[PDB]
Amino acid sequence: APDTSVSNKQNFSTDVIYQIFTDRFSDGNPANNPTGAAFDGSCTNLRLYCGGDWQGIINKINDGYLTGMGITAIWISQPVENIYSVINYSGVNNTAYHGYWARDFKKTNPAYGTMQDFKNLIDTAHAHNIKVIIDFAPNHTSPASSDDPSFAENGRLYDNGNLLGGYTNDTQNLFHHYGGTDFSTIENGIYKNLYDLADLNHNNSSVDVYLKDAIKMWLDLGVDGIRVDAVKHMPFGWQKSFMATINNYKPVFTFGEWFLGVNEISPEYHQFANESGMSLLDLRFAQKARQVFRDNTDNMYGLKAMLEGSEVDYAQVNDQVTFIDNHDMERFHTSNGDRRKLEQALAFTLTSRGVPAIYYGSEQYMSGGNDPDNRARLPSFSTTTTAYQVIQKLAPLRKSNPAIAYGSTHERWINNDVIIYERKFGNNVAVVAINRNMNTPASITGLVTSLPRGSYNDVLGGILNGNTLTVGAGGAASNFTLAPGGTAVWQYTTDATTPIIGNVGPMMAKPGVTITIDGRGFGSGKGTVYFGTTAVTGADIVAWEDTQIQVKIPAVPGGIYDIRVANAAGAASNIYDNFEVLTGDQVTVRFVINNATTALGQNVFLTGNVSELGNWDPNNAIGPMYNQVVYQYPTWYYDVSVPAGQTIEFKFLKKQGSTVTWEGGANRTFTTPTSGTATVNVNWQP
């Protein structure tokens, strides 16, 4: 199948995602609406159900509203059954319209529809070449007070109708009971409760296996992607085993949100984005795009520097999901805001690297403050707004032009208010020019591009005051004036003759998993795939064609490998790095060490003899370990993903700056479980 086929569940950079709060989009079946205090058909109380469902999305795919726009992926609210309570917080009533207060991850939320309606949604979407991404929030169940069991449904968790337990009188320890987080430390935000949400305990084998069987079920129903909620609030080691479960079973694109405050970007934000096996929502992209296109708190050098920083500080910049607003921020379009600012921000995101997500209602110029104001029902299904037409013209180029789906980003011209960047992949080119200044025309001189000679017509059709670009010999464009607010897109596509890899998915799996390598110039004759120096040929390559290769991972040692393709004539591609071959299936083990006293700046880490523990390299050791909430200093603890069913050797070590202090004595050994979790409790060997 080609790389752009709806069948490619692993990579999404040729797609445009439309993010739908299911309840606020379209009520196609009123019979399923919540009644009573839980419902507000006028949708003026934005904390209640307004009635929107999966038949509403099916109807908007069928009648062409979403396909007319060129949307190839929808991201919907979490599909699982939620609590039915109307909770009153300080006079204001609240319901699970949002889908985040789960109670059974194996059933659907009936307000959205039945299992047959979810299947009709998947088959309709797929028959119209639309991929379906779902939210999945394995961090917690719902609001609960252990002191007051009558509040809400007391965090209760069910398994396909069978009650597993509640927050009050949790004798099985399905949940954490450390109090509520004050967000002071990452550790404090993982093991304590977020607000009043019953925090699930993933170190309990029953919660662990349940959440993994639950996501496999949704993979079997045909979903094509998962957005994992609250990744900043769950142990990294448990998330790595959760990702391994998906990838070793039916790998689909998975991403989450590490939230960063205004310009406060974290290393661990990037660390996790590189280590976990999942992609992140690009907060830095959205922040800078609002600072430059919306609030004018920074200028085009700020935007250039963020686009320059991302290509090198993300391992997979093509898997980062970009956006300009979403459910957690004020809407980009404000009341006194010029609509052209939104239309430029949209054209920028749709032609920029990554996987673009469009928040529902953007194209209908919705405005609103933060939650719940940014989640109003969308007011209209007009197919003639300028923003609808911008998406309609640009979104197809993700499928048709490999430079927008996969290419590099190079600023070809810039000043305080203007940027012209080129996107490049092999022979394919796209150039985009944006003038954010709404009163001054910008005089463009000396623009050089990679386009061949020709008179390129603006793909946007002049809608955002764009112009034709006249390109001469050597990519030099003749000068032009970019209109106030002007935006133009020019492109050229041809076949590549050489292999170029644009994306690989999944990026972490064990031997024998089929990975998808997407790009151009692979050719129709089966060739060779390299994991490091290891050649994979013939029947281990499941499918080979010019834009897509599907190949089984060879039985190589666990660790990080570079991938490379050679077509049937021996021409080799660029190197796709940072691919993690896992030693096998994973389980998360908690490691606890007592009597490890440290100095100022000295922390405890773990390493051992498998790639998952860093293969005895102190710089690739796991940690720093934790020591405040589940256990207190001098006892340190940490949840680590390790290969299932085998004996690993390992040792702990303290590290302050460059000095590694190893504990003495002999190496420790431990035989990991086949599934579920385990705890290892040891004492510092001097």
Ligand X SMILES: C[C@H]1O[C@H](O[C@H]2[C@H](O)[C@@H](O)[C@H](O)O[C@@H]2CO)[C@H](O)[C@@H](O)[C@@H]1N[C@H]1C=C(CO)[C@@H](O[C@H]2O[C@H](CO)[C@@H](O)[C@H](O)[C@H]2O)[C@H](O)[C@H]1O
Amino acid letter for position 510 = K
How far apart, in whole angstroms, are the C-alpha atoms of residue 354 and residue 366?
24
Is 194 a binding residue for ligand X by CB under 6 A? The answer is yes
Structure tokens at 341: 């600012």
Name the residue nearer to ligand X (CB basis): 82 or 299: 82
Return d(Cα 582, Cα 641) in angstroms, integer.
11
Q: 347 vs 358, which CB is nearer to ligand X?
A: 358
Q: How far is the CB of 57 from Ca ion (least distance, A)?
A: 11
CA 94 to chain centre: 28
100 interface partner picked from Ca ion, ligand X, none, CB below 5 to 8 A per type = ligand X
Catalytic, 229? Answer yes
CB of 348 to ligand X, least distance (A): 23
Let me know: does 616 contact 608? Beta carbons within 8 Å. Answer: yes
Distance CA 108, CA 138 (A): 15
Q: Which is nearer to ligand X, 54 or 100 (CB)?
A: 100
Q: Do 418 and 482 touch, CB atoms closer than 8 A?
A: yes
Among 27, 199, 224, 229, binds ligand X (CB under 6 A): 229
Round to the nearest angstrom and report the end-to-end CA distance of the chain: 58
Is 259 near ligand X (CB under 6 A)?
Answer: yes
Whether the bond between 624 and the residue before it is cis, its omega within 30 degrees of 0, is yes
Separation CA 400–CA 394 (nearest Å): 10
Residue with tokens 């062409």: 64
| Known catalytic membership, residue 275 | no
Q: How big is the chain, counted in residues?
A: 686
CB-based contacts of 627, cutoff 8 Å, min separation 6: 604, 633, 634, 635, 636, 637
> In the complex, what is the shortest distance from the CB of residue 172 to Ca ion, in angstroms, rounded to a whole number?
17
Cα gap 528→486, rounded to integer Å: 46
479's CB contacts (< 8 A; 6+ apart) are 443, 444, 445, 446, 447
Q: Determine if residue 177 is labeled as part of a ligand binding site.
A: no
Among 327, 353, 412, 510, binds ligand X (CB under 6 A): 327
Positions in 44-63 near Ca ion (CB under 5 A): 51, 53
Catalytic member of 135, 229, 319, 363 = 229
Determine whether the annotation assigns residue 195 to a binding site. yes
Shortest CB 98 distance to ligand X, Å: 5
Site for Ca ion in 170-229 (CB under 5 A): 190, 199
Taking the least distance from each CB to ligand X, the nearer of 97 and 314 is 97
Measured from the Cβ of residue 603, the count of other Cβ atoms closer than 10 Å reads 17
Residue 117 lies near Ca ion (rule: CB under 5 A): no
Among 11, 32, 94, 241, binds Ca ion (CB under 5 A): 32
Token output for 192: 């304590």
Minimum CB–partner distance for residue 261 and ligand X (Å): 6
Q: Select 56 or 623, whichever has its Cβ closest to Ca ion.
A: 56
Residue 111 or 451 with smaller CB distance to Ca ion: 111
Residues designated as active site = 229, 257
Binding residues: 27, 29, 32-33, 51, 53, 100-101, 139-140, 190, 193-196, 199, 227, 232-233, 327, 371, 375
Query: Given the rule CB under 5 A, which residues bind Ca ion?
Result: 27, 32-33, 51, 53, 190, 199, 233
Binding residues for substrate: 100-101, 140, 193-196, 227, 232-233, 327, 371, 375
Query: Given the rule CB under 6 A, which residues bind ligand X?
Result: 98, 100, 194-195, 197, 229-230, 232, 257-259, 327-328, 371
